[PDB]
């Protein structure tokens with residue numbers, strides 16, 4: 001159970017974005033139905049009034065929280081991966097348009113899932129803005145909590161993988177468009193019951209065996225990290 005408070009750009013807080021530049025749902029409940037339109041941008045997908053200006057090569061940091069800013073972020077039980085996708089805003093998230101910019105599942109060295117490190121990072125994880133065409137974009141941050149993913153929602157609707165999905169409206173201003181955006185996957189649609197990483201038992205299968213759901217990260221992506229970039233408490 002977690003939500004996005006807002007974003008930072010190059011280490012500078014852009015301010016509370018909830019229902020402003022984040023298409024925020026009314027609460028922190030998970031999405032579980034893989035075929036629902038809720039998979040796109042969660043349960044209240046609509047245009048919100050602001051879009052955060054960035055340039056290619058900037059660091060864009062999502063900041064998550066549980067109940068209040070910079071709290072326990074997400075329950076520690078919710079071990080799982082984190083991805084970020086991008087699509088042009090014109091799509092409204094419909095069609096084959098989502099391109100993966102970031103994937104982090106399990107860190108063998110550190111013996112931690114992406115979620116574990118997200119908590120340690122005070123909810124902060126980042127991508128570097130790619131050299132796509134200037135214009136308006138949706139950045140879809142997705143946490144998959146796997147604590148009940150031994151079952152499939154489609155089979156048992158009281159269990160299943162949980163998806164915490166947040167779409168940020170981002171305007172890319174300066175960019176030479178040297179890596180124009182390739183084709184995307186659909187949400188809903190990309191994840192099905194057979195997809196690797198959707199059904200998995202984190203308790204009896206080694207985390208080292210986990211494979212996150214495709215698609216693979218676009219070769220045009222400039223990477224990213226799960227790490228605190230800014231101290232919210234200093235505001």
Ligand SMILES: OC[C@H]1O[C@@H](O[C@H]2[C@H](O)[C@@H](O)[C@H](O[C@H]3[C@H](O)[C@@H](O)[C@H](O[C@H]4[C@H](O)[C@@H](O)[C@H](O[C@H]5[C@H](O)[C@@H](O)[C@H](O[C@H]6[C@H](O)[C@@H](O)[C@H](O)O[C@@H]6CO)O[C@@H]5CO)O[C@@H]4CO)O[C@@H]3CO)O[C@@H]2CO)[C@H](O)[C@@H](O)[C@@H]1O
Nearest residue numbers: 001002028066067074075076077078147148159202203204
């Ligand atoms: O190592 C020895 C052997 O281990 C075996 O593996 C076991 C494992 O040990 C056991 O841990 C595991 O059990 C898991 C269950 O399958 C799973 O269902 C359970 O889910 C919990 C979850 O942990 C918890 O975080 C979650 O809390 C939710 C809560 O439901 C929700 O209502 C609340 O919502 C509030 C919002 O948070 C709040 O913001 C808002 O204001 O109010 C909301 C409403 O109050 O949100 C919280 C999260 O924040 O609840 C679910 C239960 O519903 O987690 C268990 C683990 O923690 O099962 C394994 C199998 O038994 C191996 O199998 C064996 O081989 C080993 O040897």
Ligand SMILES: *[C@@H]1O[C@H](CO)[C@@H](O)[C@H](O)[C@H]1NC(C)=O
Nearest residue numbers: 033034035036037038153157
């Ligand atoms: C899952 O979503 C699909 C598509 O919206 C819907 O038809 C189906 O009823 C949903 N499943 C449940 C249990 O609500």
Ligand SMILES: [Cl-]
Nearest residue numbers: 001030147162
């Ligand atoms: Cl839960």
Ligand SMILES: [Cl-]
Nearest residue numbers: 026027029043
């Ligand atoms: Cl609700």
Ligand SMILES: [Cl-]
Nearest residue numbers: 030031032033
């Ligand atoms: Cl759902």
Ligand SMILES: [Cl-]
Nearest residue numbers: 049050051052
């Ligand atoms: Cl604006």
Ligand SMILES: [Cl-]
Nearest residue numbers: 120121227228
């Ligand atoms: Cl950190």
Ligand SMILES: [Cl-]
Nearest residue numbers: 056174175176
């Ligand atoms: Cl550029």
Ligand SMILES: [Cl-]
Nearest residue numbers: 034035188189
């Ligand atoms: Cl589908």
Ligand SMILES: [Cu+2]
Nearest residue numbers: 001002075078
């Ligand atoms: Cu939860």
